[PDB]
Amino acid sequence: LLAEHLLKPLPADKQIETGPFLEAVSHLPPFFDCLGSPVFTPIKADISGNITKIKAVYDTNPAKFRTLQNILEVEKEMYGAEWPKVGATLALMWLKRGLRFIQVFLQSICDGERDENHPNLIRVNATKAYEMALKKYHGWIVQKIFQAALYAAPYKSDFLKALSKGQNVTEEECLEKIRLFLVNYTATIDVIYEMYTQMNAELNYKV
Amino acid sequence: LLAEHLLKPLPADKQIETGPFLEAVSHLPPFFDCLGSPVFTPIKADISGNITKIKAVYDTNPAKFRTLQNILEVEKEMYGAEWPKVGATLALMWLKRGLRFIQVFLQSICDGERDENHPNLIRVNATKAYEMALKKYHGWIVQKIFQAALYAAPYKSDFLKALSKGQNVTEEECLEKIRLFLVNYTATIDVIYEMYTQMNAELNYKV
Ligand SMILES: CCCCCCCCCCCCC/C=C/[C@@H](O)[C@H](CO[C@@H]1O[C@H](COS(=O)(=O)O)[C@H](O)[C@H](OS(=O)(=O)O)[C@H]1O)NC(=O)CCCCCCCCCCC
Ligand SMILES: CCCCCCCCCCCCC/C=C/[C@@H](O)[C@H](CO[C@@H]1O[C@H](COS(=O)(=O)O)[C@H](O)[C@H](OS(=O)(=O)O)[C@H]1O)NC(=O)CCCCCCCCCCC
């Protein structure tokens, strides 16, 4: 899945380019097929959702929107007091919290975080990724959903196995494959988070 | 909403005109917006997408697919073992369940079914809806999720109002306006169901 479509390394000036960024992340939603139960299908559709809205905006004037920063700043002027709860800016605001979940989730598995009593489960890693990436932005109902949903969770091994289908590589080799992917993935997500902060564009509302 | 677009009548042969089906039902996702909670947004995604896929498979030869019945009888021949669990057929297989939920749900409200313990919840109605149209194609986890999502359900009052979009209607006038929609709506659906029975194209798998 992930380490064929590696993420371009972070540029000097820290300016992510929309087009290629979208090409790269448009590869992550099938992530969720590895999770292996159609419960998760709607999450996946939600993120694809975001990626498309961004790609739409971008496609409308690829020069005006060469970078992600260009998207945020151009929309800020363009829409109202409405901003940033509008347009691609909103799409990204959320997309990034999905990317982060993935990001923290993989890292956790990659770091031998486990439940000493039940090593082959993913609760504690999903939960930690959920704690840090989405929980702040979800009401009680939704976490009650997240909570059920954590029973569609596959076994850890079965994820990995599945997360590297065919390919042909130890569980171990598999984890390094991630550890490399994670380097740029993480650098990138952190810039996007920076960007949002510096442009007062994060919103704290819940769902 | 629901009654600026009403489903055509029913032909002498019960055959269903596809473009005027796709056109007509695609004013129904907007609906879920009326429940007033971003919880239900993914729900609508999955109907939106049912329609999309049904539509493209149509566009590709609107002569061969002039009817819904045509969709099934053609796809049936176009794959082996594959059909029914393929293409617009499967798309419509699921669409009819959402579309049924939407009917039965309203039908209930429109008939004043409620809980005397609180006639401004719609939770007994969502439930009849769900049990009758979708519960047996969902596995235990989805069902949990439904039960949780049922807590983001609005009140009957506001739900009715959100529907009205302040066309300045009275509240039992709004009920009335639905019952009208419900007529041909409840037919079309019933037919699609017969279709699917009589074609041997139902499947029973849970999710
Ligand atoms: C961040 C929160 C934490 C994570 C949350 C985890 C996710 C929770 C989501 C739970 C499930 C939501 C409901 C969606 C259910 C769908 O899976 C089902 C069946 O989906 C079908 O799957 C099929 C896949 O085929 S299969 O793998 O071989 O099965 C098809 O893809 C089909 O699309 S198609 O165009 O390709 O043909 C597709 O609809 N959809 C439904 O159940 C219909 C939903 C109608 C909802 C009605 C509203 C009820 C809600 C109550 C409102 C008060
Ligand atoms: C009949 C079946 C039972 C009924 C089913 C009930 C519904 C189940 C699904 C529950 C919800 C699933 C999770 C998604 C929740 C989303 O509402 C949130 C917010 O999403 C944003 O909502 C917004 C709505 O706007 S707002 O009202 O102004 O807020 C925007 O639409 C924005 O999209 S945008 O591109 O157009 O801009 C959109 O992402 N989505 C998330 O939190 C992202 C989820 C990330 C993936 C989670 C991965 C963890 C899953 C567990 C894995 C073990």
Residue numbers in the entry:
A (entry chain A), B (entry chain B): 3 to 209
Lines quoted from the article behind this entry:
In human GLTP, a glycolipid headgroup recognition centre located on the protein surface enables selective binding of the GSL head and ceramide amide groups via multiple specific interactions. Encapsulation of lipid chains within the hydrophobic pocket involves a cleft-like gating mechanism that results in two glycolipid-binding modes. To elucidate the structural dynamics of the GLTP–GSL dimer and associated adaptations, we comparatively analyzed nine novel crystal structures of wild-type GLTP (wtGLTP) and the sulfatide-specific mutants D48V and A47D/D48V complexed with N-lauroyl-containing monosulfatide (N-lauroyl-3-O-sulfo-galactosylceramide; hereafter referred to as 12:0 monoSF) and disulfatide (N-lauroyl-3,6-di-O-sulfo-galactosylceramide; hereafter referred to as 12:0 diSF) in different crystal forms and compared them with previously studied GLTP–24:1 monoSF complexes.
The crystals of the wtGLTP–disulfatide complex represent ‘open’ and ‘closed’ conformations of the dimeric arrangement. However, adaptations within the open and closed dimers necessitate slightly different overall lipid conformations. The first noticeable deviations in the surface contact areas occur in wtGLTP–disulfatide complexes, which probably indicate a slightly different mutual orientation of monomers compared with wtGLTP–monosulfatide complexes. Interestingly, ligand adaptations also emerge with wtGLTP complexes bound with disulfatide. In contrast, the 6-O-sulfo group adopts different conformations/positions that depend on the protein (wild type or D48V) or the crystal type.
